[PDB]
Amino acid sequence: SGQQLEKGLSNLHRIVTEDLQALEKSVSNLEESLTSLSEVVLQNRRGLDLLFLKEGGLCVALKEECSFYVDHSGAIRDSMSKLRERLEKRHKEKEAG
Amino acid sequence: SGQQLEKGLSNLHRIVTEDLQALEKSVSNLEESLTSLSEVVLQNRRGLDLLFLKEGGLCVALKEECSFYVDHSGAIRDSMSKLRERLEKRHK
Amino acid sequence: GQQLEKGLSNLHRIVTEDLQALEKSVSNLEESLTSLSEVVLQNRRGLDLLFLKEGGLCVALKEECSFYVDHSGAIRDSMSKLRERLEKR
Ligand SMILES: [Cl-]
């Protein structure tokens, strides 16, 4: 029935939106955590550079190529903020369905 | 075509479910890795506080405000556990 | 319900857009996290050097060593196959 199918479509939309919201929220929590941890790590490394000051710093002291952090904070937060906008609007829309 | 639309709804449901499960598994893997890394980092920091014991610890020695780790593990694990339950219970 | 076909393809399109945003973000998180783990293990090699005669960092602390749990390969493959499906779609 057409009205039956309308309700199934609305119901599918409602439940997929809820699952996408759970993922957006979790991805944004991971970004916040990971960025905060990167600040802890680079502060730890500033401490190591001071302890190794005589030897030219941590990476020189170890005689190794210096590893560096790859920061995607801006891109993830922009992407997830636009996703939140879409999901929140779709969520209020389907409260009527 | 009403019958075909019904199969269409079910087909879309199946396909989205498989993609949501892929993201759920990867989010959960990322959370396990990130949480394990935070314990490594904090252990490294305890070692640095030992090395800077006479200067009052790492952050005093550097004359900086201490950076703070923001932990969301419980919230991420609960969000994803509930999402796995909904995905599984609707699987028909 | 007369435009159900348009509603269904619309839903498919919207969800595809949202899954693509989540895939890109998960994959960026994976690259950042893996890079941070390399910085952190290099930091710990420095600490093990400073504590060499004590037997390294975790012995000097009198603690069991914490270790990094790596899922890079699994995440990358999962997200590669997802991108493969989403672009086909
Ligand atoms: Cl560290």
Side-chain angles (χ1 to χ4, degrees), chain A residues 1-2 4-53 55-64 66-97, chain B residues 1-5 8-53 55-64 66-87 89-91, chain C residues 1-61 63-86 88:
Chain A
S1 150
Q4 264 152 48
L5 293 167
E6 279 201 1
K7 190 47 191 243
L9 181 58
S10 277
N11 261 115
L12 185 48
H13 200 173
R14 201 178 288 105
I15 66 178
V16 176
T17 295
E18 146 175 31
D19 296 344
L20 290 173
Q21 280 183 126
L23 290 160
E24 184 286 318
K25 190 213 100 172
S26 288
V27 164
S28 295
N29 279 340
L30 285 164
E31 187 284 318
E32 182 182 24
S33 285
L34 170 67
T35 296
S36 77
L37 190 61
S38 85
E39 289 158 353
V40 177
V41 170
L42 292 184
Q43 183 172 63
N44 282 359
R45 172 169 288 206
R46 287 193 291 279
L48 286 163
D49 277 338
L50 166 58
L51 289 157
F52 282 115
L53 176 66
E55 301 72 35
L58 169 67
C59 290
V60 179
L62 290 168
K63 303 183 172 63
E64 298 170 5
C66 217
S67 294
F68 69 86
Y69 178 59
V70 176
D71 187 5
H72 289 302
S73 193
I76 290 152
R77 284 170 74 80
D78 168 270
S79 171
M80 298 288 110
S81 165
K82 289 151 173 213
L83 179 56
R84 275 199 310 283
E85 283 194 23
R86 294 195 298 285
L87 297 179
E88 297 178 310
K89 161 219 159 260
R90 298 217 307 279
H91 186 97
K92 315 162 162 118
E93 280 173 347
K94 285 297 105 176
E95 299 275 23
Chain B
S1 207
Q3 294 281 358
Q4 300 177 310
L5 275 171
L9 279 166
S10 296
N11 182 71
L12 182 56
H13 182 85
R14 200 193 83 251
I15 288 155
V16 174
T17 284
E18 143 196 345
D19 299 340
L20 291 168
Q21 285 172 338
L23 292 155
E24 185 276 331
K25 295 190 208 313
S26 296
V27 168
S28 289
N29 273 335
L30 283 168
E31 184 282 324
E32 199 181 8
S33 299
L34 173 61
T35 295
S36 78
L37 194 55
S38 75
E39 304 293 347
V40 175
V41 172
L42 292 173
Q43 186 168 56
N44 285 357
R45 174 157 292 199
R46 290 196 293 282
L48 283 162
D49 285 331
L50 182 48
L51 291 163
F52 284 116
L53 179 59
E55 296 85 351
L58 170 73
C59 295
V60 174
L62 294 168
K63 308 195 224 306
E64 304 178 2
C66 255
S67 289
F68 168 75
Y69 176 63
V70 175
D71 184 7
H72 288 304
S73 52
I76 295 162
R77 284 177 198 160
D78 186 46
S79 180
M80 303 290 98
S81 166
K82 302 311 180 133
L83 170 56
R84 291 191 303 271
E85 288 172 25
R86 294 194 303 279
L87 289 164
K89 93 186 169 165
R90 286 159 197 163
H91 183 298
Chain C
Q2 293 196 304
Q3 304 199 281
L4 273 145
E5 297 273 8
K6 171 187 198 179
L8 184 63
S9 63
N10 195 39
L11 176 57
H12 194 171
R13 183 191 65 91
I14 283 78
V15 173
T16 295
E17 151 202 62
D18 296 343
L19 293 165
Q20 286 171 350
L22 286 166
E23 184 287 322
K24 281 199 217 333
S25 288
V26 166
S27 286
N28 283 336
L29 289 167
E30 185 280 327
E31 173 173 47
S32 297
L33 176 55
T34 289
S35 82
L36 193 60
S37 76
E38 294 162 359
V39 172
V40 167
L41 300 173
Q42 178 168 68
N43 285 359
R44 176 164 290 200
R45 293 191 291 278
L47 284 164
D48 279 335
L49 191 184
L50 289 161
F51 286 117
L52 202 30
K53 61 190 170 278
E54 295 91 353
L57 169 68
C58 303
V59 168
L61 292 169
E63 303 180 12
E64 288 157 12
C65 254
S66 284
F67 73 93
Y68 178 61
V69 174
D70 184 28
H71 292 299
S72 180
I75 296 160
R76 271 162 191 160
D77 180 52
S78 170
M79 273 322 80
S80 279
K81 303 310 243 143
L82 175 62
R83 280 195 313 276
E84 148 194 303
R85 297 195 299 279
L86 293 170
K88 194 182 300 188

